[PDB]
Amino acid sequence: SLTRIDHIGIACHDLDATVEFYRATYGFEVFHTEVNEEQGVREAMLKINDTSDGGASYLQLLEPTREDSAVGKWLAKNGEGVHHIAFGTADVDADAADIRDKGVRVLYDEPRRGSMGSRITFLHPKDCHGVLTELVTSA
Amino acid sequence: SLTRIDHIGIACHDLDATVEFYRATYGFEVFHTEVNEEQGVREAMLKINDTSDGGASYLQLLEPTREDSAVGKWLAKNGEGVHHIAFGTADVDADAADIRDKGVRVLYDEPRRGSMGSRITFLHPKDCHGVLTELVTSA
Numbered sequence: 160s161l162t163r164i165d166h167i168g169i170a171c172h173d174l175d176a177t178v179e180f181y182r183a184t185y186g187f188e189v190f191h192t193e194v195n196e197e198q199g200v201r202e203a204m205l206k207i208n209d210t211s212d213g214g215a216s217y218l219q220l221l222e223p224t225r226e227d228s229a230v231g232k233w234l235a236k237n238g239e240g241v242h243h244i245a246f247g248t249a250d251v252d253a254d255a256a257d258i259r260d261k262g263v264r265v266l267y268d269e270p271r272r273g274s275m276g277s278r279i280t281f282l283h284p285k286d287c288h289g290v291l292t293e294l295v296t297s298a
Numbered sequence: 299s300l301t302r303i304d305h306i307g308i309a310c311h312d313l314d315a316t317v318e319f320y321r322a323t324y325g326f327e328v329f330h331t332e333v334n335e336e337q338g339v340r341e342a343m344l345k346i347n348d349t350s351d352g353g354a355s356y357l358q359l360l361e362p363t364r365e366d367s368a369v370g371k372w373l374a375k376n377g378e379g380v381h382h383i384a385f386g387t388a389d390v391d392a393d394a395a396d397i398r399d400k401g402v403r404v405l406y407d408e409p410r411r412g413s414m415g416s417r418i419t420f421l422h423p424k425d426c427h428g429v430l431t432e433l434v435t436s437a
């Protein structure tokens with residue numbers, strides 16, 4: 160079952176500049192940074208709060224590592240802004256299988272590696288009224 | 299201080315169809331619905347979780363009441379998708395005054411009425427790396 164908003168994925172041209180804007184304007188600190196070569200992103204997680212299911216909610220700031228990537232293509236077309244939303248679950252494999260059985264396109268057979276060792280999948284935005292939708296089980 | 303993600307604002311052509319997609323696909327229920335004539339929206343709040351600051355996080359589904367509105371114009375230009383993000387605070391007036399003092403454009407002098415009697419303001423998306431950003435104090 161999906162038990163939280165895990166994160167808001169925000170695409171930006173310059174991660175270091177955008178991280179500084181969040182820190183200076185709101186006082187949000189960097190929880191974690193990493194590069195995901197498979198996804199083609201340099202990412203910064205800013206933790207905003209903890210959640211009633213035992214997890215947390217983050218802003219996930221993303222800069223593309225290459226133009227030919229999900230976020231590189233999206234930035235080229237749309238400019239900086241919200242790229243995806245992510246829901247947390249204790250069992251991404253089971254929740255993904257249930258949602259596949261409703262005819263929503265699940266982009267990965269098997270969950271892949273996301274932030275901080277998480278296991279992730281995505282739902283096609285054209286099946287979700289225009290919202291690229293991530294499912295996340297934390298490590 | 300901003301202590302939670304309050305909500306994700308999602309623009310849609312047909313609120314009743316989009317609410318049904320969230321209910322059928324994820325099991326999310328309607329927490330509240332209302333019309334905001336000033337903002338030009340018919341809205342549905344779906345509660346996803348409670349938050350460590352005592353508040354909650356929602357999906358805010360929005361259908362425009364008229365074409366000449368924030369959401370009507372955005373839908374016309376961009377199609378269905380994420381429209382804004384909202385941060386919760388115990389004192390929207392003070393947090394708005396601090397952010398005004400950093401040169402980020404605050405759209406309302408005085409917080410206005412939002413969902414469930416809340417007091418809200420917005421930050422200009424061109425000052426926030428492309429993200430229309432709401433500040434919310436719950437009633």
Ligand SMILES: C/C(C(=O)O)=C(/O)SCCNC(=O)CCNC(=O)[C@H](O)C(C)(C)COP(=O)(O)OP(=O)(O)OC[C@H]1O[C@@H](n2cnc3c(N)ncnc32)[C@H](O)[C@@H]1OP(=O)(O)O
Binds near residue numbers: 200279283291
């Ligand atoms: C690591 C991490 C984490 O949480 O752990 C992350 O979040 S990594 C985050 C980065 N990774 C990902 O996003 C992986 C999942 N995304 C993808 O696989 C792809 O971006 C998708 C969904 C398939 C789309 O393919 P592609 O990038 O090749 O562009 P596309 O040209 O195929 O676009 C197909 C249509 O979908 C629309 N479209 C594309 N990206 C979209 C988005 N982010 N939100 C809403 N709509 C979107 C686009 O406007 C096209 O619509 P029209 O037909 O033109 O109207």
Ligand SMILES: C/C(C(=O)O)=C(/O)SCCNC(=O)CCNC(=O)[C@H](O)C(C)(C)COP(=O)(O)OP(=O)(O)OC[C@H]1O[C@@H](n2cnc3c(N)ncnc32)[C@H](O)[C@@H]1OP(=O)(O)O
Binds near residue numbers: 382
């Ligand atoms: C009740 C409730 C609740 O929580 O309680 C709600 O949330 S009600 C939610 C609905 N209410 C609101 O959104 C009120 C706040 N929004 C506004 O006042 C306006 O939409 C804004 C920000 C000023 C923009 O003005 P307008 O609608 O007239 O369109 P615009 O043509 O002025 O656009 C100016 C530029 O800003 C860009 N722009 C417009 N809306 C945007 C959005 N949602 N996210 C990111 N960028 C956006 C647009 O692409 C233009 O960029 P280019 O220069 O072309 O690149």
Ligand SMILES: [Cl-]
Binds near residue numbers: 194195196197
């Ligand atoms: Cl990697």
Ligand SMILES: [Cl-]
Binds near residue numbers: 333334335336
């Ligand atoms: Cl009203």
Ligand SMILES: [Co+2]
Binds near residue numbers: 245
């Ligand atoms: Co993500």
Ligand SMILES: [Co+2]
Binds near residue numbers: 307358382384432
């Ligand atoms: Co809102």
